[PDB]
Design a protein around this ligand. Structure first.
Ligand code: NA
Ligand code: NA
Lengths: 486, 486
């Protein structure tokens, strides 16, 4: 009977009432997987390059090209900073990955990260008014090992094209060295989305969840399952934001993190883990299950599910448990099971369940802010300033257990983030532009965003972007429904 | 007196009658440099990123991003070639430069090449239907010398992002090593626009120039001023197309090329000049002036900086001299100086003089053709096919001493280049897509270029690209005039 609308807004209604809750969840994930396959091929990707300058007539090329363009090359040679306003550089972000950790799918090979990086680049334009491209590279050295110095050298060479570097999907602990070095060696800001960007949105999420459960951040026990770059960065911001590290426990694959973890202390590449080891889990919990009894908050970024976070764990938590399970493409548990177990607030990293806690609602504002005041780097306080803007944006339009965080469907989030991030950067002493107010940044970010969204809509109404075929949609739903019944 | 039109078509008439020929030439140069400065700052560059996929509703992000995008990650991992259609890669060109030979300005530091590489990317979209971005890199090693191996390594790592690589503005002999190695090692086509690109359009102009003066290619004495990477490739294509090597002389800084250059002999980084030493200029001409008397064709692309072509060399040439002076931003001699000295046909690299012999009129068509049928390499044959296509397109609508070649205002040149280059790639055995006909390839090129042009036009007509202020046009004019009248 039911048929998807072109805007996909009625997917829930098109899934037969006969499916179980695990069948709806698995069908949702199969639909979007099969649809991704079809849509990417239909349009041959997701982004394109366009003029943004007047093409009124042939002779404009004499100013864009020879002979006129020569003044640009000499102006830049003599004053490198003018590359920021004479070329797209000022608004141009490289989305650099070696594809070693592309979502929960792992090392997907060097071109393998294109779908994800191209999606980041798309969201940067449409959400953030930022021009960005995917830069998927091979970081393998001559011995066939993915090598942090290969990526460091690369970015140092390519920095001159860009206004910021946005590292993505790089396995740990390479990603720490890559970022720790680049961030101080480059003349443009470099950061790792998976680090402060995930951490930023995770905090923003927790901030509002804590207002809805009426607890103070400092009194809350919190369990962190998985100890990769996202989770370690989340814990760090959460503590800076007022959480008591003594009430916190993190787990890697070998057990809990604590004083006695000599395996972690001796390998300094894992210094972020080792700091957590020195400062949290004073009780040295041996198991997740013990750690969760009474816990207030469970934050997971581990192996893709099903069944990695256990219903029993959640059942044993305190009053109005907050559960974030953000592994991709499949969360550690589906939201219907966690609510069955008693969770009051459940978040995942995907857009097809409520409460999407995903850096896509953080990077565009963090990046745009940093670009506008030319911040030298992305500081933790900047990241936190964006956590606050996002949490406050959502609160001020209404929040509840099934809507705790700003969504990708609310463009207003991003100039708010950009202006707060910009002022924090001036405050932290890392901005090179200091002559702009909160309002002036907001206005710049707002305009670029509106201009980006109106251009792209115009190109859709006119059918330079062709409508996707109704029939391929019908085919993706049948495909999804067949997988979970047949 | 007239003010400049929005479309810049009437600059000649806005330049005062009383100006001398020298003043008029210099004032055009200064006008376009000063307008380049103003317009690049006005739009903060020339190109932008834009969605090319449907954004009909929020849930679409679930296909473009987590969770759906994971299908793309794994699809690519298991079939790397599918990257060419599940992402922009299949139509994505990197304009790679170390900014070491950027026009006649030469080495402008790494970010200094951005003006020129952005104009190239702007042209690939608007003339060729190609998505392209500037990639300006630092190639300097620790000792601060430009290192070809750095460029080789860099491109090898980034190749995974792109459907082709378009090397630009790399100093010789580095450009040879980089091109020659990369074209064999990368799994996409790599070429150097200043090599086959420039030689493609140079041959095209020569073809029509020769028709106009009624001379057979093989019966012309040709003198080449400069042994740079452009001129070298110009000579080589012009020989393959049928010139007599015995009737040809090339000059470098130290005098004519001939088989007695021990000089060039053992430095095998310069093997291309060496092949030319073995095969040309049997006579051992002892000065450019000795060479030029009775010559038919004189071709210079001195890079960098200002080259020399003398009035007296031209005056000594034969019946109806053909003179190409393509140095940018100022040619070796201006057209009116070459005309006064007896030249019948004169080309420069600029669009503000007749007969613009510039790669911008060959690269959009070459790359587009190569991209469609997935050519592994850009062969010399393929470059030559584009030349015949360019020259024949021009001859069909009429050629004359002041209009010998197709212009950037004639968008039909490029689907025709694309289809001829494609067929040639199949014939050369470098095409990975072998069963499309000329018409099928033409159709794809034409449809892409038309979509790109109309998309761009819609964005201007809509005011998303703002009209450039008339007041600033008027200022640039006055500025230019003022520079020349004091
Ligand atoms: Na969610
Ligand atoms: Na010209």
């Amino acid at each position: 009977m039911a048929q998807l609308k072109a805007d996909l807004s009625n997917l829930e209604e098109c899934l037969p009432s006969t499916l179980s809750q695990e069948q709806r969840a698995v069908a949702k994930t199969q639909f979007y997987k099969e649809l991704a396959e079809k849509v990417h091929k239909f349009y041959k990707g997701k982004i394109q390059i366009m003029p943004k300058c007047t093409l009124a007539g042939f002779n404009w090329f004499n100013a864009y090209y020879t002979p006129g363009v020569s003044r640009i090359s000499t102006n830049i040679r003599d004053n490198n900073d003018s590359s920021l306003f004479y070329s797209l550089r000022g608004n141009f972000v490289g989305v650099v990955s070696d594809s070693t950790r592309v979502l929960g799918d792992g090392d997907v090979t060097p071109p393998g990260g294109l779908g994800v990086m191209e999606g980041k680049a798309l969201l940067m334009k449409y959400l953030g008014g930022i021009d960005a491209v995917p830069i998927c590279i091979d970081s393998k050295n001559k011995e066939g090992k993915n090598d942090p110095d290969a990526v460091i050298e690369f970015v140092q060479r390519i920095q001159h094209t860009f206004g910021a570097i946005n590292l993505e999907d790089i396995s740990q602990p390479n990603c720490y060295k890559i970022l720790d070095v680049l961030r101080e060696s480059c003349d443009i800001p470099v950061w790792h989305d998976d680090q402060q960007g995930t951490a930023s949105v995770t905090l923003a999420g927790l901030l509002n969840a804590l207002k809805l459960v009426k607890k103070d951040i400092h009194e809350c026990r919190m369990v962190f399952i998985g100890a990769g770059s996202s989770n370690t960065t989340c814990l760090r911001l959460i503590v800076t934001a007022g959480a008591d590290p003594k009430k916190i426990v993190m787990f890697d694959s070998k057990g809990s993190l604590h004083n006695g973890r000599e395996d972690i202390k001796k390998d300094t590449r894992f210094y972020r883990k080792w700091e957590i080891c020195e400062t949290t889990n004073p009780s040295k919990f041996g198991s997740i299950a013990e750690a969760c009894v009474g816990a207030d908050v469970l934050i997971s970024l581990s192996t893709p599910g099903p069944g990695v976070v256990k219903a029993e764990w959640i059942k044993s938590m305190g009053e109005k448990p907050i559960v974030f399970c953000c592994a991709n493409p499949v969360p550690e548990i589906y939201p219907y099971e966690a609510k069955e177990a008693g969770a009051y607030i459940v978040a995942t990293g995907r857009g097809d369940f409520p409460n999407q806690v995903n850096n896509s609602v953080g990077f565009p504002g963090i990046l745009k802010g940093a670009l506008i005041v030319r911040a030298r780097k992305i500081t933790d306080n900047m990241a936190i300033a964006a956590s606050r803007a996002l949490a406050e944006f959502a609160e001020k339009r209404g929040i509840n257990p099934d809507n705790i965080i700003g969504t990708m469907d609310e463009p207003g989030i991003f100039p708010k983030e950009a202006a707060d991030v910009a002022m924090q950067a001036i405050k932290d002493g890392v901005a090179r532009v200091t002559d702009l107010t909160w309002q002036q940044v907001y206005d710049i970010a707002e305009h670029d965003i509106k201009e980006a969204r109106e251009s792209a809509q115009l190109l859709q109404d006119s059918k330079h972007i062709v409508d996707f075929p109704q029939e391929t949609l019908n085919e993706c739903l049948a495909y999804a429904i067949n997988k979970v019944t047949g």
